[PDB]
Amino acid sequence: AYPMSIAAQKNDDDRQARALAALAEKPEAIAAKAEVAPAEILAILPQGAAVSAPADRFDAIWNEMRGWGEILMIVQTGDIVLEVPGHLPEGTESHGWFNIHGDSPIGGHIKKDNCAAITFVDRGFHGRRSCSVWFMNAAGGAMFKIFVRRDENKELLAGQLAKFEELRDGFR
Amino acid sequence: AYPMSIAAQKNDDDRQARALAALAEKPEAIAAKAEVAPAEILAILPQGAAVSAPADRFDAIWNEMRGWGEILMIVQTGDIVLEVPGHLPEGTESHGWFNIHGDSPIGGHIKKDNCAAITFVDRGFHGRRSCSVWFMNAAGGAMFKIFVRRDENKELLAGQLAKFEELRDGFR
């Protein structure tokens, strides 16, 4: 909106430069924080690796994932990474918050009105394919992430993976 | 360390003033963010309501709580409050991180080297007594919180509560 200055644009150009350069380690998105916000590193991944749906699809996507079986819920801050396996429960909504409680260890409150985008990330993570759904906030960071689980043989669960790909493809 | 200025001290005094004043709603600590950091509102609660142990007690306290049975783990950010019921699993440590994984839905990684204090909070929460253990970071915020559970009758679980009080009293 506001006019840009030569230095500001230059600062931007250099920022993107560091972004691309930092991606050198092709296979953690947050770690690649040499420069800017996670959503900026996501927009720089190979085409198809980061497919976003509009925030208004929040309820449809959540309902969809509730049928995926046991997934892995992950919330991360600079002090902790909490990983909780479980089925996604039904949620009720009031004043911008999506209150989730059901027969699952995954419970609490999601500030749904803070969601700016929902990005399906399908990329190599340290040698292996990783599939997850990132609910992004207005600041370009992940509010939380839902990961597709792996089986005994360490491979992405077939049935769940198919549903992820199916949903993700629809937004591509 | 560095010398204070009249305005800076005044700013501080006014800050504490807002803190105390905001506490008007005697029974959420974070909500009381009219002015400063959570640890500052904690240090303002009635004597005994917030008892802190030194960060070096991290392992002893975690081991202690692992014997408390099913507790409630809570991590909160501006976008989400994740509440996970479960037993605390054993953890291993490497490079400042406490990696917790076991027979429990509570799993992941805690940045143990970021812990500055562990505060036992025993206070009225909206009419009723609430007991929890806050692992604080250097910035005066809670990294995560472990809450004592309630039973069918909605009262704090007797056996668990006793262990909490016992441990907390020892630091008072």
GROMACS .gro file of C-alpha atoms in nm:
model
  344
    1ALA     CA    1   0.000   0.000   0.000
    2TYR     CA    2   0.249   0.261   0.121
    3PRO     CA    3   0.523   0.359  -0.126
    4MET     CA    4   0.848   0.161  -0.115
    5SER     CA    5   1.194   0.314  -0.079
    6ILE     CA    6   1.502   0.197  -0.271
    7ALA     CA    7   1.660   0.066   0.049
    8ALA     CA    8   1.340  -0.109   0.159
    9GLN     CA    9   1.303  -0.290  -0.174
   10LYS     CA   10   1.674  -0.373  -0.167
   11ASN     CA   11   1.625  -0.508   0.186
   12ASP     CA   12   1.341  -0.720   0.047
   13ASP     CA   13   1.540  -0.845  -0.251
   14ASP     CA   14   1.827  -0.940  -0.019
   15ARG     CA   15   1.577  -1.109   0.212
   16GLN     CA   16   1.443  -1.331  -0.066
   17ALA     CA   17   1.803  -1.396  -0.168
   18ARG     CA   18   1.886  -1.532   0.179
   19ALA     CA   19   1.563  -1.732   0.169
   20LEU     CA   20   1.654  -1.907  -0.156
   21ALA     CA   21   2.017  -1.946  -0.048
   22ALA     CA   22   1.921  -2.088   0.292
   23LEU     CA   23   1.700  -2.343   0.117
   24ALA     CA   24   2.037  -2.493   0.016
   25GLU     CA   25   1.967  -2.760   0.277
   26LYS     CA   26   1.677  -2.874   0.058
   27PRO     CA   27   1.525  -3.121   0.309
   28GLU     CA   28   1.323  -2.774   0.879
   29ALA     CA   29   1.120  -2.487   0.727
   30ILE     CA   30   1.131  -2.292   1.054
   31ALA     CA   31   1.506  -2.349   1.085
   32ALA     CA   32   1.534  -2.179   0.748
   33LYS     CA   33   1.469  -1.861   0.945
   34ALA     CA   34   1.786  -1.691   0.830
   35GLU     CA   35   1.565  -1.422   0.689
   36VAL     CA   36   1.187  -1.413   0.714
   37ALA     CA   37   0.859  -1.584   0.795
   38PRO     CA   38   0.787  -1.959   0.747
   39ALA     CA   39   0.517  -1.881   0.488
   40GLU     CA   40   0.789  -1.715   0.281
   41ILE     CA   41   1.005  -2.029   0.275
   42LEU     CA   42   0.691  -2.230   0.192
   43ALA     CA   43   0.616  -2.008  -0.109
   44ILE     CA   44   0.971  -2.085  -0.224
   45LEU     CA   45   0.947  -2.467  -0.222
   46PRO     CA   46   0.909  -2.665  -0.548
   47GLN     CA   47   0.571  -2.613  -0.718
   48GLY     CA   48   0.317  -2.850  -0.566
   49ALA     CA   49   0.507  -2.897  -0.239
   50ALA     CA   50   0.307  -2.620  -0.070
   51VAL     CA   51  -0.056  -2.591  -0.181
   52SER     CA   52  -0.272  -2.344   0.010
   53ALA     CA   53  -0.649  -2.332   0.055
   54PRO     CA   54  -0.836  -2.016   0.165
   55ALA     CA   55  -0.900  -1.966   0.538
   56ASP     CA   56  -1.275  -2.003   0.480
   57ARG     CA   57  -1.215  -2.375   0.418
   58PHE     CA   58  -1.120  -2.420   0.787
   59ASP     CA   59  -1.434  -2.612   0.889
   60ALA     CA   60  -1.447  -2.826   0.573
   61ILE     CA   61  -1.083  -2.926   0.608
   62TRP     CA   62  -1.113  -3.001   0.980
   63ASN     CA   63  -1.424  -3.214   0.918
   64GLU     CA   64  -1.240  -3.388   0.635
   65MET     CA   65  -0.938  -3.470   0.852
   66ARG     CA   66  -1.160  -3.602   1.132
   67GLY     CA   67  -1.223  -3.896   0.901
   68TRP     CA   68  -0.851  -3.962   0.850
   69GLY     CA   69  -0.816  -4.170   1.164
   70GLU     CA   70  -0.528  -4.120   1.407
   71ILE     CA   71  -0.308  -3.833   1.291
   72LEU     CA   72  -0.026  -3.645   1.463
   73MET     CA   73  -0.101  -3.300   1.603
   74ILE     CA   74   0.201  -3.074   1.649
   75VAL     CA   75   0.231  -2.735   1.817
   76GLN     CA   76   0.573  -2.572   1.838
   77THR     CA   77   0.717  -2.266   2.012
   78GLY     CA   78   1.075  -2.168   2.082
   79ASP     CA   79   1.052  -2.358   2.412
   80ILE     CA   80   0.856  -2.671   2.321
   81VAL     CA   81   0.741  -2.903   2.044
   82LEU     CA   82   0.433  -3.097   2.156
   83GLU     CA   83   0.342  -3.399   1.944
   84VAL     CA   84   0.011  -3.567   2.019
   85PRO     CA   85  -0.122  -3.870   1.829
   86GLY     CA   86  -0.499  -3.903   1.812
   87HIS     CA   87  -0.820  -3.863   1.615
   88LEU     CA   88  -0.933  -3.505   1.561
   89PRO     CA   89  -1.247  -3.437   1.769
   90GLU     CA   90  -1.552  -3.232   1.677
   91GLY     CA   91  -1.534  -2.863   1.757
   92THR     CA   92  -1.782  -2.592   1.852
   93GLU     CA   93  -1.729  -2.223   1.780
   94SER     CA   94  -1.771  -1.899   1.974
   95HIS     CA   95  -1.607  -1.557   1.945
   96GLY     CA   96  -1.333  -1.657   1.701
   97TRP     CA   97  -1.232  -1.970   1.890
   98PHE     CA   98  -1.283  -2.329   1.781
   99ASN     CA   99  -1.319  -2.533   2.099
  100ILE     CA  100  -1.224  -2.895   2.041
  101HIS     CA  101  -1.313  -3.169   2.288
  102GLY     CA  102  -1.399  -3.534   2.231
  103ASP     CA  103  -1.280  -3.890   2.278
  104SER     CA  104  -0.919  -3.800   2.203
  105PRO     CA  105  -0.614  -3.674   2.391
  106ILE     CA  106  -0.607  -3.386   2.140
  107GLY     CA  107  -0.814  -3.112   2.300
  108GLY     CA  108  -0.824  -2.744   2.379
  109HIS     CA  109  -0.892  -2.427   2.184
  110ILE     CA  110  -0.793  -2.305   1.839
  111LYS     CA  111  -0.812  -1.933   1.755
  112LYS     CA  112  -0.983  -1.999   1.423
  113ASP     CA  113  -1.034  -1.632   1.342
  114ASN     CA  114  -0.654  -1.593   1.330
  115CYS     CA  115  -0.625  -1.835   1.037
  116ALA     CA  116  -0.503  -1.669   0.718
  117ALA     CA  117  -0.442  -1.982   0.512
  118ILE     CA  118  -0.422  -2.360   0.529
  119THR     CA  119  -0.121  -2.503   0.346
  120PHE     CA  120  -0.074  -2.867   0.249
  121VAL     CA  121   0.299  -2.939   0.266
  122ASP     CA  122   0.430  -3.243   0.078
  123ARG     CA  123   0.808  -3.254   0.078
  124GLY     CA  124   1.120  -3.449   0.147
  125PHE     CA  125   1.209  -3.428   0.512
  126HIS     CA  126   1.555  -3.555   0.578
  127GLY     CA  127   1.555  -3.814   0.302
  128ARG     CA  128   1.185  -3.911   0.332
  129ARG     CA  129   0.851  -3.778   0.212
  130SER     CA  130   0.653  -3.587   0.476
  131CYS     CA  131   0.288  -3.483   0.442
  132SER     CA  132   0.120  -3.233   0.672
  133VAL     CA  133  -0.150  -2.966   0.687
  134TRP     CA  134  -0.037  -2.626   0.816
  135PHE     CA  135  -0.296  -2.385   0.954
  136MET     CA  136  -0.125  -2.047   0.902
  137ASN     CA  137  -0.183  -1.724   1.093
  138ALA     CA  138  -0.175  -1.368   0.955
  139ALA     CA  139   0.194  -1.342   1.045
  140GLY     CA  140   0.296  -1.626   0.812
  141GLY     CA  141   0.368  -1.875   1.086
  142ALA     CA  142   0.205  -2.212   1.154
  143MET     CA  143  -0.060  -2.207   1.428
  144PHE     CA  144  -0.034  -2.586   1.441
  145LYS     CA  145   0.032  -2.873   1.200
  146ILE     CA  146  -0.146  -3.202   1.134
  147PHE     CA  147   0.087  -3.476   1.009
  148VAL     CA  148   0.000  -3.795   0.824
  149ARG     CA  149   0.115  -4.090   1.036
  150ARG     CA  150   0.360  -4.369   0.951
  151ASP     CA  151   0.314  -4.742   1.006
  152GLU     CA  152   0.535  -5.012   1.159
  153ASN     CA  153   0.744  -5.029   0.842
  154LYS     CA  154   0.796  -4.652   0.882
  155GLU     CA  155   0.608  -4.570   0.561
  156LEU     CA  156   0.327  -4.314   0.538
  157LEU     CA  157  -0.002  -4.484   0.627
  158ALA     CA  158  -0.159  -4.581   0.293
  159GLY     CA  159  -0.525  -4.502   0.355
  160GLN     CA  160  -0.452  -4.175   0.533
  161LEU     CA  161  -0.196  -4.067   0.274
  162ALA     CA  162  -0.447  -4.120  -0.007
  163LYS     CA  163  -0.700  -3.890   0.164
  164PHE     CA  164  -0.433  -3.624   0.218
  165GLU     CA  165  -0.324  -3.633  -0.147
  166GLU     CA  166  -0.689  -3.631  -0.259
  167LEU     CA  167  -0.775  -3.323  -0.052
  168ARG     CA  168  -0.447  -3.145  -0.138
  169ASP     CA  169  -0.483  -3.215  -0.513
  170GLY     CA  170  -0.824  -3.046  -0.509
  171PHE     CA  171  -0.665  -2.716  -0.410
  172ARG     CA  172  -0.387  -2.740  -0.667
  173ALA     CA  173   2.312  -0.334   3.575
  174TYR     CA  174   2.295  -0.022   3.357
  175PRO     CA  175   2.190   0.300   3.534
  176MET     CA  176   1.819   0.383   3.542
  177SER     CA  177   1.666   0.711   3.426
  178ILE     CA  178   1.386   0.895   3.607
  179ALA     CA  179   1.146   0.823   3.321
  180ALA     CA  180   1.247   0.456   3.302
  181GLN     CA  181   1.189   0.402   3.674
  182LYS     CA  182   0.863   0.595   3.648
  183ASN     CA  183   0.767   0.371   3.356
  184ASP     CA  184   0.845   0.073   3.580
  185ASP     CA  185   0.649   0.207   3.876
  186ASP     CA  186   0.350   0.272   3.650
  187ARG     CA  187   0.391  -0.078   3.505
  188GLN     CA  188   0.369  -0.241   3.848
  189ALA     CA  189   0.075  -0.012   3.923
  190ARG     CA  190  -0.117  -0.145   3.621
  191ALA     CA  191  -0.017  -0.497   3.723
  192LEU     CA  192  -0.164  -0.463   4.072
  193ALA     CA  193  -0.467  -0.274   3.939
  194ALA     CA  194  -0.532  -0.531   3.666
  195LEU     CA  195  -0.525  -0.805   3.929
  196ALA     CA  196  -0.859  -0.650   4.030
  197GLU     CA  197  -1.020  -0.952   3.864
  198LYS     CA  198  -0.861  -1.165   4.138
  199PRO     CA  199  -0.947  -1.506   3.986
  200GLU     CA  200  -0.630  -1.567   3.368
  201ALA     CA  201  -0.271  -1.468   3.455
  202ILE     CA  202  -0.184  -1.420   3.088
  203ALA     CA  203  -0.498  -1.213   3.031
  204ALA     CA  204  -0.365  -0.984   3.302
  205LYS     CA  205  -0.124  -0.868   3.032
  206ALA     CA  206  -0.226  -0.505   3.057
  207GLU     CA  207   0.133  -0.432   3.140
  208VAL     CA  208   0.411  -0.689   3.157
  209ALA     CA  209   0.523  -1.051   3.166
  210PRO     CA  210   0.327  -1.340   3.325
  211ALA     CA  211   0.605  -1.398   3.580
  212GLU     CA  212   0.544  -1.042   3.700
  213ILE     CA  213   0.175  -1.108   3.770
  214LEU     CA  214   0.276  -1.434   3.941
  215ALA     CA  215   0.515  -1.249   4.174
  216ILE     CA  216   0.218  -1.028   4.265
  217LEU     CA  217  -0.024  -1.304   4.374
  218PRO     CA  218  -0.093  -1.372   4.744
  219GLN     CA  219   0.207  -1.519   4.930
  220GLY     CA  220   0.213  -1.895   4.880
  221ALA     CA  221   0.006  -1.890   4.561
  222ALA     CA  222   0.320  -1.885   4.345
  223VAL     CA  223   0.616  -2.080   4.484
  224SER     CA  224   0.919  -2.113   4.256
  225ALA     CA  225   1.196  -2.373   4.252
  226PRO     CA  226   1.533  -2.316   4.081
  227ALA     CA  227   1.571  -2.430   3.718
  228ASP     CA  228   1.825  -2.694   3.826
  229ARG     CA  229   1.536  -2.888   3.984
  230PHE     CA  230   1.395  -2.958   3.634
  231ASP     CA  231   1.481  -3.330   3.627
  232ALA     CA  232   1.382  -3.395   3.989
  233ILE     CA  233   1.046  -3.226   3.942
  234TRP     CA  234   0.973  -3.402   3.613
  235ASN     CA  235   1.062  -3.740   3.767
  236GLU     CA  236   0.843  -3.653   4.065
  237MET     CA  237   0.543  -3.566   3.847
  238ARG     CA  238   0.583  -3.884   3.643
  239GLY     CA  239   0.455  -4.062   3.953
  240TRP     CA  240   0.147  -3.841   3.978
  241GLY     CA  241  -0.056  -4.046   3.732
  242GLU     CA  242  -0.258  -3.886   3.454
  243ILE     CA  243  -0.210  -3.508   3.459
  244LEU     CA  244  -0.307  -3.238   3.210
  245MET     CA  245  -0.035  -3.094   2.988
  246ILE     CA  246  -0.106  -2.749   2.847
  247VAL     CA  247   0.083  -2.546   2.588
  248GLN     CA  248  -0.057  -2.209   2.482
  249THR     CA  249   0.025  -1.953   2.214
  250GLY     CA  250  -0.176  -1.663   2.079
  251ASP     CA  251  -0.325  -1.901   1.821
  252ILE     CA  252  -0.385  -2.221   2.018
  253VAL     CA  253  -0.428  -2.378   2.361
  254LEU     CA  254  -0.348  -2.750   2.344
  255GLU     CA  255  -0.463  -2.957   2.641
  256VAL     CA  256  -0.344  -3.317   2.655
  257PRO     CA  257  -0.432  -3.559   2.935
  258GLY     CA  258  -0.179  -3.833   3.004
  259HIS     CA  259   0.105  -3.967   3.217
  260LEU     CA  260   0.436  -3.786   3.181
  261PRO     CA  261   0.686  -4.011   2.999
  262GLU     CA  262   1.057  -4.052   3.064
  263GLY     CA  263   1.285  -3.813   2.881
  264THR     CA  264   1.638  -3.823   2.743
  265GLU     CA  265   1.858  -3.517   2.701
  266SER     CA  266   2.086  -3.380   2.430
  267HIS     CA  267   2.201  -3.028   2.343
  268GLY     CA  268   1.963  -2.842   2.572
  269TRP     CA  269   1.655  -3.039   2.469
  270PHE     CA  270   1.462  -3.287   2.679
  271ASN     CA  271   1.313  -3.539   2.438
  272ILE     CA  272   1.005  -3.704   2.585
  273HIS     CA  273   0.856  -4.020   2.437
  274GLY     CA  274   0.678  -4.310   2.603
  275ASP     CA  275   0.344  -4.485   2.645
  276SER     CA  276   0.152  -4.158   2.651
  277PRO     CA  277  -0.005  -3.918   2.402
  278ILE     CA  278   0.213  -3.647   2.558
  279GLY     CA  279   0.531  -3.646   2.352
  280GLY     CA  280   0.779  -3.425   2.174
  281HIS     CA  281   1.065  -3.201   2.279
  282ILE     CA  282   1.116  -2.954   2.562
  283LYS     CA  283   1.391  -2.691   2.540
  284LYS     CA  284   1.508  -2.759   2.894
  285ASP     CA  285   1.804  -2.521   2.873
  286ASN     CA  286   1.556  -2.234   2.830
  287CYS     CA  287   1.404  -2.295   3.175
  288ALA     CA  288   1.464  -2.010   3.418
  289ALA     CA  289   1.231  -2.123   3.695
  290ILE     CA  290   0.958  -2.372   3.783
  291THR     CA  291   0.663  -2.213   3.964
  292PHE     CA  292   0.393  -2.401   4.153
  293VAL     CA  293   0.072  -2.201   4.115
  294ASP     CA  294  -0.208  -2.266   4.365
  295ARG     CA  295  -0.491  -2.018   4.324
  296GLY     CA  296  -0.857  -1.957   4.278
  297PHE     CA  297  -0.949  -1.985   3.915
  298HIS     CA  298  -1.294  -1.856   3.848
  299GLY     CA  299  -1.438  -1.954   4.184
  300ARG     CA  300  -1.238  -2.280   4.225
  301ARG     CA  301  -0.892  -2.381   4.339
  302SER     CA  302  -0.649  -2.460   4.057
  303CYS     CA  303  -0.310  -2.628   4.102
  304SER     CA  304  -0.043  -2.637   3.831
  305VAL     CA  305   0.331  -2.642   3.772
  306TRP     CA  306   0.465  -2.372   3.541
  307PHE     CA  307   0.801  -2.423   3.371
  308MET     CA  308   0.912  -2.062   3.306
  309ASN     CA  309   1.151  -1.937   3.040
  310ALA     CA  310   1.402  -1.650   3.070
  311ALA     CA  311   1.141  -1.408   2.935
  312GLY     CA  312   0.903  -1.466   3.225
  313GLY     CA  313   0.649  -1.664   3.026
  314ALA     CA  314   0.532  -2.022   3.075
  315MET     CA  315   0.697  -2.275   2.843
  316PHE     CA  316   0.419  -2.518   2.934
  317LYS     CA  317   0.204  -2.600   3.236
  318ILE     CA  318   0.117  -2.926   3.413
  319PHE     CA  319  -0.223  -2.919   3.582
  320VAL     CA  320  -0.355  -3.142   3.859
  321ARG     CA  321  -0.663  -3.325   3.726
  322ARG     CA  322  -1.020  -3.324   3.858
  323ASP     CA  323  -1.246  -3.624   3.916
  324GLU     CA  324  -1.607  -3.700   3.821
  325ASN     CA  325  -1.734  -3.481   4.104
  326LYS     CA  326  -1.521  -3.201   3.954
  327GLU     CA  327  -1.292  -3.182   4.258
  328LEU     CA  328  -0.912  -3.193   4.240
  329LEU     CA  329  -0.799  -3.556   4.241
  330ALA     CA  330  -0.712  -3.634   4.604
  331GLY     CA  331  -0.400  -3.847   4.564
  332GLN     CA  332  -0.251  -3.625   4.294
  333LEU     CA  333  -0.335  -3.305   4.481
  334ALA     CA  334  -0.156  -3.432   4.792
  335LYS     CA  335   0.164  -3.496   4.593
  336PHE     CA  336   0.144  -3.150   4.436
  337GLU     CA  337   0.101  -2.979   4.775
  338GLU     CA  338   0.379  -3.193   4.922
  339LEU     CA  339   0.627  -3.101   4.648
  340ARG     CA  340   0.519  -2.733   4.643
  341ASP     CA  341   0.541  -2.700   5.024
  342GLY     CA  342   0.903  -2.817   5.012
  343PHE     CA  343   1.000  -2.513   4.806
  344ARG     CA  344   0.811  -2.269   5.026
   0.00000   0.00000   0.00000
